[PDB]
């Protein structure tokens, strides 16, 4: 009952600068994304800039931990999310016109500023990107503007997902199966108050019917797919894991215990990446994943050539209108769709704002 | 499901049922005849007294070898016992019956057990070992139970 929340105005201001530092590294990512680069190169430099910038901010309070709440995940045209290539793993080269999707997070006092964005690289100045890859990102952008407008204590959790299903049907697309938004509190990215998109019969009865509440942080995340809704595995190593503090077990391995203690020092409860270590890290992760000490964040692939897009950010709830601390660089001038919106409620929410 | 003795007014009635319950049929039949016609609160109190051995059930039909007790004199009888397992199983079915009565919306402070029936269930098989290389049955005697409670006051 003593857990910290947005009730402190100091918490508000450190949210604003933490979201600003998360937005500014996404900006450096999109300005440094060019043809002939590597996904691994952009991931390692994206996290390295986070580590040094969070070190130089809040140098006055260092009893706590400042750094990554979600590692720099970079995926292109085939991966849903949770992707961070290892040095021993194969790399990918960025070409002309491919849309790349970047996830990134910062945390201060265990309080999270999380943000993503989907953008096409090497975009010619003053041109229009079309096709079936240009409407999934525009629909997802409309989903993000929908959530920004409608997030308010007084609605239900199913209102968001039915609107997301509706805008999916309007754009002749569908949401990704089993994608969950979370209520983000102190030291937590896995809050119990969760939001579903593209549900099924099994996930619906396991989802909890709940009503929103004032003065709390959310991670509104939308996954829009131009295909059919298929996300599976293709034998790729899962890199991102999160410590589960509820459970414990007696490790039988010296290098697994060393791996776990390295997690406690750097990423004690928040999701991390195996890149930060690596030879013994790959050994020490398989046993800790076996006994559910770490929650794997698996990589998901769709049919080759299909297109999926993401848009997520941390939004603050307050009775006098919600506010945004994390935003991505999307411009609707150079992104249009071959299908427009036909629904009255959708056109009303995109017109109005806080 | 089709009971026997469907209620005269089904709106003011609730039903409960259990099948293949692993209690002795003979004990449960005697306990059911004890609580038949009782009020819901009175029967719940009575069954709790059976487990506390303050009130006994009279063994009227299945009484071969059943001992005598002083508490049998409340009934017009001489033999009585305190079947703990039969009382516990009927207590659970009475809780289920009153939960059904709440679900229908009719109040639970005026219910009376107007129907209660114990049927024999299919027998379960075990083995016992006897003197000269013989095997004999060790059959269990489970029972189905059904009950209907009707509002009356």
């Amino acid at each position: 009952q003593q857990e910290q929340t947005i009730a402190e105005d100091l918490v508000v201001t450190k949210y604003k600068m933490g979201g600003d530092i998360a937005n500014r590294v996404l900006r450096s990512l999109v300005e440094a994304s060019s043809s002939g680069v590597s996904v691994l190169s952009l991931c390692e430099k994206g996290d390295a800039m986070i580590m040094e910038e969070t070190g130089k901010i809040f140098k006055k309070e260092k009893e706590m931990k400042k750094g990554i709440a979600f590692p720099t995940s970079i995926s292109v045209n085939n991966c849903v999310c949770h992707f961070s290539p290892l040095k021993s793993d194969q790399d990918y080269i960025l070409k002309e016109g491919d849309l790349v999707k970047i996830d990134l997070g910062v945390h201060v006092d265990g309080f999270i500023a999380n943000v993503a964005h989907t953008f096409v690289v090497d975009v010619a100045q003053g041109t229009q990107v079309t096709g079936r890859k240009a409407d999934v990102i525009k629909a997802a952008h409309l989903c993000a503007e929908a959530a920004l407008r409608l997030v308010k204590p007084g609605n239900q959790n199913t209102q968001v997902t039915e609107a997301w299903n509706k805008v999916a049907h309007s754009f002749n697309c569908t949401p990704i199966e089993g994608m969950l938004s979370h209520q983000l509190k102190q030291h937590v990215i896995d809050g119990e108050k969760t939001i579903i998109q593209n549900p099924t019969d099994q996930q619906k009865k396991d989802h909890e019917k709940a009503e929103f509440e004032v003065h709390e942080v959310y991670a509104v995340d939308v996954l829009v797919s131009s295909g059919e809704g298929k996300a599976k595995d293709a034998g790729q190593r899962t890199t991102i894991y999160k410590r589960d503090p509820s459970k414990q077990y007696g490790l039988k391995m010296k290098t697994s215990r060393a791996f776990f203690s390295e997690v406690e020092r750097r990423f004690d409860a928040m999701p991390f990446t195996l890149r930060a270590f690596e030879k013994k890290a790959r050994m020490g992760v398989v046993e800790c994943a076996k006994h559910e000490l770490l929650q794997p964040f698996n990589v998901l692939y769709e049919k080759e050539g299909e297109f999926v897009a993401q848009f997520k950010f941390t939004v603050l709830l307050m009775p006098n209108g919600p506010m945004r601390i994390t935003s991505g660089p999307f411009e609707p001038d150079l992104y249009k769709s071959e299908m427009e919106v036909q629904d009255a409620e959708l056109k009303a929410l995109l017109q109005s704002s806080a | 499901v089709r009971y026997s003795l469907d209620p005269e007014n089904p709106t003011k009635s609730c039903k409960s049922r259990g099948s293949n319950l692993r209690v002795h049929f003979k004990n449960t039949r005697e306990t059911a005849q004890a609580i038949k016609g009782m009020h819901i609160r009175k029967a719940t109190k009575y069954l709790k007294d059976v487990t506390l051995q303050k009130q006994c059930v009279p063994f009227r039909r299945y009484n071969g070898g059943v001992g005598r007790c002083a508490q049998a004199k409340q009934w017009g009888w001489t033999q009585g016992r305190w079947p703990k397992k039969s009382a516990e199983f009927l207590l659970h079915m009475l809780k289920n019956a009153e939960s059904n009565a709440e679900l229908k919306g009719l109040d639970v402070d005026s219910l009376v057990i107007e129907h209660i029936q114990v049927n024999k269930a299919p027998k379960m098989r075990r083995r016992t070992y006897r003197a000269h290389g013989r095997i004999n049955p060790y059959m269990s005697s489970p029972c189905h139970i059904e009950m209907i409670l009707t509002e009356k006051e």
């Binding site: 599976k232 595995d233 293709a234 034998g235 | -």
Partner: protein, 61 residues
């Protein structure tokens, strides 16, 4: 990308054995992925590689 015995028959003993070596290496990697979790794509490729090995050996014999 499958292997057809009809196009195998023109090949020589050197490249036929090279193709057999490549298939056997792939199968051994698939068996590794089978015991290390892997994916259904790699699990279902086991039968494809196994029939390809038999196809090459039948052509050789």
């Amino acid at each position: 990308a499958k292997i057809k015995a009809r196009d195998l028959r023109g090949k020589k003993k050197e490249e036929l054995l090279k193709q057999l070596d490549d298939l056997k290496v792939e199968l051994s990697q698939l068996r590794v992925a089978k015991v290390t979790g892997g994916a259904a794509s790699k699990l279902s490729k086991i039968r494809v590689v196994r029939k390809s090995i038999a196809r090459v050996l039948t052509v050789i014999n």
